[PDB]
Design a protein around this ligand. Structure first.
Ligand SMILES: CN1C(=O)[C@H](O)[C@H](O)[C@H]1CN[C@@H](CO)c1ccccc1
Ligand SMILES: *[C@@H]1O[C@H](CO)[C@@H](O)[C@H](O)[C@H]1NC(C)=O
Ligand SMILES: [Zn+2]
Length: 1015
């Protein structure tokens, strides 16, 4: 195993180092506005060294943006694909690349057999080539790596089955900035090349000057370079035709033959395209070849990529003709005029890469090595695209919830083979596809129109319901005596209970367990643990009486706590935000202990009075002018008092102090230790009143944030033996700090209401001497060092926070883990901040054509981990990575993959069993079974089950935590007959494994295995 901590990789370009050195000056470079006037030696090219030019027709098809997926499919994409089929069939030298398999699958399944066969033939023959082959072309900022893999696998599995192809070149022309998580997954999915486009205009200029636009992109910790993937960065402002032929868009636009008038298009540079004729072809070729030769100067080989396309291009028959015929006339002239020393043709992306590497092998170029990322993107001036790290935060959080329900549903149902009548494969396919669709760079990014956002939400809601149906059928099967098991596949044996989604105060949707002497004495509940290690975790249920006690299925008493059910209401009468307590339902909380990848059953039982093993929380309402708060049968009266500082400690964990406004002020780790200043504060950013306006994409604040005026907010303190909390009703935010004996959990119920042109930020203020350094994660996969740069505007120092961020000095670290991707930064030493929501009246001129005024209440969740790190083995000051501790990693897992909770629906569960998976290996804490997926239907003689295994890297801080069992996924199911290592998409076998044993993976590695079973 490579050491990912102690060896700083030696690379030609390291992006944090490059950032430190660059000036980022935005000067007018001429026709290439963000570059310089390119010059070339006309004599570079000659009879023995020609420029080989590949013109690659393409059509960027967004799976939802201004229209829904289906509206675009009906109005544009079905015609593009239909006419591609006809035009490529009829013109054998014409070529076309296709990226978005969600659309291609929608189209293909509507084709007659005659046309399916024509389509297979133009793919087989190389005229139509798929690039990447994902369901979509995903966002790279907000997306979790698990879901990037999911959507890649969904599209590539479809391509292998129906088109018999697996792309090895990736095409990512539109995500707003780019992440090294992409080459990481792609290189472990068989890819050999990838292309990116949207990177900061200063980076394009800098890399172009050094001919470093093509590079071997390796991970920031990778000393050897085995993760490296060849990458092509496009050099110019856009992937459209004006910005892809060469440096001067006034010239390139004359070669977009759709822009002549009848198509309702024109050239902003005021010179139209002209049809190519025998009389003008020489002149036109001399303009175009000059553009090509200038572009060629920015790259190292004599092979040149010229994309030819734009959004939803190549629709009309007349458009296919006008592009193809004019380019054929140019190629014929250019290729026949020796003085140009060019050979130009239509080509595919793979053709371009193959020729580049032929040039490399011929010794004509060596490519530089690069590590780091390409955030935060700016396309011009100070227009940094950090706004979309937060836009539509409700769906950003929904993404993480569905991420987990997909994994759990696929896992739970993988243990058995299911009859076709069970509709298990059917429901899982719908769930995977709706989640995969939302990875699109207008989905999770929150940059689609209101009605399109609604479509994605409805689609995800259907996916959640599909997951629940699969999960609960699976649980009933796994925990019922087999000779009693009698499934109705439409029936709800269990309902899922989820405490954090949509969340209290977002949707009243949790069911109460209704118990009573005259109705039902007891109720079975079941917890599922998707992680491959034993887990204890507090779980809570709503119940109809405070007098409930908990047992396991051996009837052992389990300690429980009952609290009230509290909801916060904006009282239009008193103009206050204050809590109301239920008089009919209560919360019961207890510790569930669940096997690795397993299930555990508990029983809740009512009695007429306080049970022995159930305690009751006290509740203290702090506000001047209190009124009574009756709580039904709840046995402890609520106490009242004026606002005041408070301190709490659960178990033997940290002691937290709060301000009289209910916000954290300090954490004391142990009985002896200092009360370390850790202050939560809410602030607001506004919008500029002159110049460019913030919108869905751009963050353009009118200065540093200003404190939210809090007034005298109402504070609720609930204190229990198992769980305590402080909750406060702030303007736009009900802010809750929850304590269960370790790192606190923070929940924010965020309702920005009608505050237009406002972004609400949550900031932490500490005395950690972090300087200008902070750490943020990429796609939930790795933590990258950031350096705050005062030479850049505030918005440029915002980065994606897809799952976590931290600051540290020599002794102390604070980590904030998230349950949803949001934007954030560290704008001064000792600070962390993370945006909660943003409501923007204006459009930001990127094509969306609206502000963001469709906000809705969202429950954001966090864990907050303050730790001593002076004893940890940390990377050197020059290493570009950072690593979590054990506690912070577990805290992240608690947010993203909690225990699932199931309530038995019927009155009696005959044949119920107490546990499943007690004999599953409890793997080392840095290892996860990220994916468990049965890959065969029940008719297959040889069953196959796929696993994706991910090992993270946790700091060594002198806490052994030792003795664990080896996890061999190939023996999780009986009668194993074969075990293979595969690509992460399961589509290619890489290694046949001795003794049918899957080896565990190295830190920061991810592997896939498929076990085969003869049963
Ligand atoms: C920023 N964008 C998005 O959010 C979409 O994904 C779209 O493809 C892309 C914009 N494409 C450009 C054209 O190349 C465009 C710009 C304005 C209006 C229409 C399209
Ligand atoms: C699938 O593709 C491979 C590529 O080499 C080929 O050998 C095989 O015959 C193809 N299967 C078909 C044509 O169905
Ligand atoms: Zn796009």
């Amino acid at each position: 195993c490579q050491d990912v901590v102690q060896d700083v990789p030696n690379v030609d370009v390291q992006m944090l180092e490059l950032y430190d050195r660059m000036s980022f000056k935005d000067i007018d470079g001429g026709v290439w506005k963000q570059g310089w006037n390119i010059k070339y030696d006309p004599l570079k090219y000659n009879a023995h060294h020609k420029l080989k030019v590949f013109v690659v027709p393409h059509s960027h098809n967004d799976p939802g943006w201004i229209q829904t997926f289906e509206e675009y499919y009906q109005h544009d994409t079905k015609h593009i694909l239909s006419n591609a089929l006809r035009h490529l069939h009829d013109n054998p030298e014409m070529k076309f690349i296709w990226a978005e398999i969600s659309y291609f699958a929608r189209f293909y399944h509507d084709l007659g057999e005659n046309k399916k066969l024509q389509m297979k033939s133009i793919v087989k023959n190389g005229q139509l080539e798929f690039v990447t082959g994902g369901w979509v072309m995903p966002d790279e900022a907000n997306s979790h790596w698990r879901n990037v893999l999911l959507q890649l696998t969904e599209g590539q599995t479809w391509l292998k089955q129906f088109m018999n192809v697996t792309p090895t070149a990736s095409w990512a022309i539109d995500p707003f900035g780019h992440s090294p998580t992409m080459p990481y997954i792609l290189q472990k999915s068989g890819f050999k090349n990838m292309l990116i486009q949207r990177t900061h205009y200063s980076v394009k200029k800098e890399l172009a000057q050094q001919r470093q636009l093509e590079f071997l992109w390796r991970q920031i910790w990778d000393n050897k370079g085995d993760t490296a993937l060849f990458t092509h960065m496009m050099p110019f402002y856009s992937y459209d035709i004006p910005h892809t032929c060469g440096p001067d868009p006034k010239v390139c636009c004359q070669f977009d033959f759709k822009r002549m008038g009848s198509f309702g298009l024109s050239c902003p540079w005021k010179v139209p395209p002209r049809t190519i004729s025998d009389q003008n072809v020489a002149a036109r070729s001399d303009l175009l070849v000059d553009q090509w030769k200038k572009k060629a100067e920015l790259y190292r080989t004599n092979v040149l990529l010229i994309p030819l396309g734009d959004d939803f291009r190549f629709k009309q028959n007349t458009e296919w003709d006008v592009q193809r015929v004019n380019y054929e006339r140019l190629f014929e002239h250019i290729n026949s005029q020796a003085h140009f020393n060019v050979q130009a043709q239509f080509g595919t992306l793979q053709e371009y890469f193959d020729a580049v590497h032929q040039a490399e092998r011929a010794g004509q170029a060596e490519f530089p090595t690069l590590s780091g990322d390409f955030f935060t993107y700016a396309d011009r001036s100070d227009n940094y695209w950090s706004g979309y790290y937060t836009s539509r935060p409700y769906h950003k959080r929904m993404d993480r919830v569905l991420m987990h329900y997909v994994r759990a549903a696929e896992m739970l149902s993988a243990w058995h083979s299911w009859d076709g009548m069970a509709r298990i494969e059917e429901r899982l396919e719908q769930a995977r596809r709706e989640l995969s669709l939302f990875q699109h760079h207008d989905g999770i990014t929150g940059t689609a129109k209101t009605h399109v956002v609604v479509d994605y939400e409805q689609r995800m809601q259907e996916a959640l319901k599909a997951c629940q149906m699969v999960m609960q059928q699976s649980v009933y099967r796994l925990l019922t005596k087999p000779s009693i098991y009698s499934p109705d596949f439409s029936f709800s044996y269990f309902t899922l209970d989820d405490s954090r989604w949509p969340g209290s105060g977002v949707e009243d949707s949790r069911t109460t367990i209704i118990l009573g002497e005259d109705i039902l004495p007891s109720k079975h509940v079941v917890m599922h643990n998707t992680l491959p290690h034993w887990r204890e975790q507090l779980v809570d249920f709503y119940v109809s009486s405070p007098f409930v006690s908990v047992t396991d299925l051996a009837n052992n008493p389990v300690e429980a706590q009952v609290s009230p059910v509290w909801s916060w209401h904006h009282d239009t009468l008193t103009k206050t935000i204050h809590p109301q307590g239920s008089t009919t339902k209560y919360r019961i909380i207890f510790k569930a202990r669940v096997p690795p990848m397993g299930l555990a059953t508990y029983v809740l039982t009512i009695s007429d009075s306080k049970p022995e093993h159930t305690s009751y929380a006290s509740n203290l309402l702090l506000r001047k002018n209190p009124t009574s708060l009756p709580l039904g049968q709840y046995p402890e009266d609520v106490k009242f008092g004026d606002p005041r500082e408070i301190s709490l400690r659960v178990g033997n964990g940290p002691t937290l102090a709060f301000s009289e406004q209910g916000l954290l002020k300090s954490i004391q780790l142990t009985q002896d230790s200092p009360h370390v200043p850790v202050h939560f504060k809410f602030l607001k950013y506004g919008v500029r009143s002159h110049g460019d306006r913030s919108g869905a994409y751009l963050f353009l604040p009118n200065g540093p944030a200003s404190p939210v005026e809090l007034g005298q907010p109402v504070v609720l303190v609930t204190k229990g033996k198992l769980e305590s909390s402080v909750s406060v009703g702030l303007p736009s935010v009900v802010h809750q700090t929850i304590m269960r004996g370790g790192a606190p959990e923070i929940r924010n119920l965020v309702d920005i209401g009608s505050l237009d042109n406002t972004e609400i930020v949550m900031r932490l203020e500490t005395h950690i001497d972090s300087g200008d350094i902070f750490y943020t994660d990429l796609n939930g996969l790795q933590f990258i060092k950031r350096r705050r740069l005062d030479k850049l505007p505030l918005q440029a120092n915002y980065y994606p926070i897809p799952s976590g961020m931290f600051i540290e000095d020599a002794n102390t670290r604070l980590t904030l883990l998230t349950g949803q991707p949001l934007g954030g930064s560290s704008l001064a030493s000792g600070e962390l901040e993370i945006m909660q929501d943003r409501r923007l009246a204006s459009d930001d001129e990127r094509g969306l054509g609206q502000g963001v005024l469709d906000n809705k209440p969202v429950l954001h969740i966090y864990r907050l981990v303050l730790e001593k790190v002076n004893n940890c083995v940390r990377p050197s000051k020059l290493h570009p990575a950072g690593y979590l501790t054990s506690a912070a990693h577990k805290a992240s897992q608690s947010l993203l993959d909690p225990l699932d909770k199931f309530i038995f629906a019927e009155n009696e569960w005959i044949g119920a069993q107490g546990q499943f998976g007690g004999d599953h290996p409890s793997a080392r804490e840095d290892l996860d079974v990220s994916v468990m997926r049965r890959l065969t239907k029940s008719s297959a003689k040889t069953q196959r089950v796929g696993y994706v295994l991910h090992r993270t890297n946790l700091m060594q801080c002198g806490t052994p935590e030792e003795h664990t069992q080896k996890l061999d996924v190939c023996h999780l199911l009986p009668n194993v007959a074969r075990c293979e290592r595969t690509t992460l998409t399961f589509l290619q076998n890489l290694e046949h494994l001795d003794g049918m044993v899957a080896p565990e993976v190295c830190p920061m590695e991810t592997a896939a295995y498929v076990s085969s079973h003869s049963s």
